[PDB]
Structures are given as structure tokens and as C-alpha cells.
Design a protein around this ligand. Sequence first.
Ligand SMILES: O[C@@H]1[C@@H](O)[C@H](O[C@@H]2CO[C@H](F)[C@H](O)[C@H]2O)OC[C@H]1O
Ligand SMILES: O[C@@H]1[C@@H](O)[C@H](O[C@@H]2CO[C@H](F)[C@H](O)[C@H]2O)OC[C@H]1O
Length: 329
Amino acid sequence: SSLPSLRDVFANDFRIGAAVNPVTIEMQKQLLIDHVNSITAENHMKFEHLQPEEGKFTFQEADRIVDFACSHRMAVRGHTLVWHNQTPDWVFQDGQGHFVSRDVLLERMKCHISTVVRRYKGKIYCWDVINEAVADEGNELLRPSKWRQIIGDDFMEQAFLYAYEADPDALLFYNDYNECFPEKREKIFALVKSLRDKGIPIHGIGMQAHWSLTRPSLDEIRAAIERYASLGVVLHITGLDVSMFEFHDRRTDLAAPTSEMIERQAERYGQIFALFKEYRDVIQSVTFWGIADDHTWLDNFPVHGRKNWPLLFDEQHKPKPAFWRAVSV
Ligand SMILES: O[C@@H]1[C@@H](O)[C@H](O[C@@H]2CO[C@H](F)[C@H](O)[C@H]2O)OC[C@H]1O
Ligand SMILES: O[C@@H]1[C@@H](O)[C@H](O[C@@H]2CO[C@H](F)[C@H](O)[C@H]2O)OC[C@H]1O
């Protein structure tokens, strides 16, 4: 009640978002009502949860999310249309189990994008059209996927054009993680630049920001923001969390974060939101991949069965030290 509200603190800087599902909307309803003005479906707008079999569309869970957001004057980011994960096998196969042709996959891609985007047209203001197409390792530009294998390397151009046709007023995003590591940053930059140089309707870059206490550095974050902003795209931070474990740290037995973990996380969030506020002219939305530590995908990724404490509020929905530094930049 004396607590500052995140969306109000950052009212002149960017929207503040949370990834949700119908369960967490109930479990965290007051935090969301008190703090966010944007919502993303954590899972229920992905392909497998919208069209699990060809021509079987299951919008019920996504509808509940959109209804909640609309009834509390919250924006919605749509996540996500074309991704190498969480897409059913049927999409890439024919009746006899072999891979479809380029033309057939483009038909199915267009039908899915058209049906999904048109349903929420005028309620959802932007879409992550392509998720994580850039290779996360190695020297190649693109990660392998059945989308790319079957259609070809222009599969992303087609996806953006299909979504633009379905809702030409939506902001269309390329969304990715490890977006601040320089080698991947340059691949993402080259990819988006090349699409923009062909007049493809890509309006924004989504920086997932699945970050650790140490990585990426503040200078890497600054360099990535400027690198992407130089393309003239809008920037969203789309899945922010600050993991208590580095990538090499696969420990399972930590029952609580240490005092220094909690303090460093507070400092880290303060530094991050200071940098975001500094780039308020190009960052228009900051969405956390959750909202409080009683629900985070980092409990089971990348190590199944442990516990992480990545967000501004604790499991009892109380502000953490990170909250206070974040709102005081
Ligand atoms: O499934 C994806 C996952 O592979 C990816 O991996 C890590 C995310 O957290 C940091 F960014 C790590 O350094 C990455 O290697 O995160 C996105 C998720 O959708
Ligand atoms: O519940 C998990 C979900 O949170 C996860 O979401 C991805 C997290 O990494 C990025 F933000 C991706 O773009 C998200 O879609 O996906 C796996 C699921 O089990």
C-alpha cells in the first residue's frame, strides 16, 4: 500500500510486463493488478497450445489470458508464432509420415498465423513472429529447424509477411536469447538488417534477457541495445529474469539463495534498470518471464527439479531487495 507500483515508477520509460498462464493469473493476481501494464502468455499462445492437431484450434487458455489483460487495461504481447520448439509434429508431416513440401508448409504456416493473429487483432499489439532462429553456437547464422529445412532460409520473410497481412497494425518482432553475447548479437543484427533491407515488415527486436548475476556485462547490454537500436527497430525486453546460477552452475541442493546472492541480485537489477531507463527512448517495454519467485521456469531449466529466485518479488509475493534498487533508478 506504501509500495511503489512498477508500471507507475516506469510510466515515462516503458511498460512493465509479466509472462502468465491461467493458473498464475489466479495465484499472483494482486501482484499483476498492482504492478504490470502488459501481459505475455508464458506458453498458451505457442503453436502446440493453439493448434495441437491440424484444424483443431484451442484458444480457451489464451482467451482467458487476453480477457484478464483487457479487463485490467493491460497490453498483450503475442508469443510466439514460428519457433523450433513447442510445435507439434503434424505441422511438418504428410499422412504417410514424410516431410511436406515448401509450398504445403507455407500454406500451413499462413493458415496458423492468419487464424491466430486475426482472432486477437485489436487486442494484441505486437507478436513475436520468429523465435530463436539464430544459431546459439558455432559459425553458422541460422539454427537448424524443420521450418528452415523444409521451406528454405526465406521462411522468416514469409512468416513476417503473413503476420503483417493478418494484422498490419501489429508490431512484429524477432525475439531471441543470449542477445548480448557479441558473436550472437552480430548474427541477430545481420539477420534483422538483411530482412529490413528487403523491406520485410519486422518492426522490433525482442531481447529475452534470460540473464545471470554476471552475464552479460553491463557493457555488453549497452552495446547490444545500441547495436539493435541503430537498425531503427523498436526494442522490447521480453523475458527478463536474473538467475542465481551461472550457466556452469548446475547445483541442485541449494535450499535458499545466500545473502550475497540476494545482495548481488539487487545490485544487478539496479544496474540493469538504470541502463534501461537510460535507453528509454528506444526501449518501450520490459517484460519479466514471471513476476514472483513462487513461479519461474528456471526452477526446472536448465536443471530439472531445483529452485531459483530470479524475480523482484519472493515466494510470499513480498518485495525483495532487488525490487527497491530497481524502482529507485
Ligand atoms: O529453450 C531456450 C533455452 O535453450 C535458452 O537457454 C539459455 C537461456 O538462459 C541464458 F540465456 C543461457 O545462457 C541460455 O543458454 O533460453 C531460452 C529458452 O527458450
Ligand atoms: O514453461 C516453460 C516456458 O517458461 C518456456 O518459455 C520460454 C522461455 O525462454 C524464452 F523466453 C522463450 O521464448 C519462452 O517461450 O518454454 C518452455 C516451457 O516449458
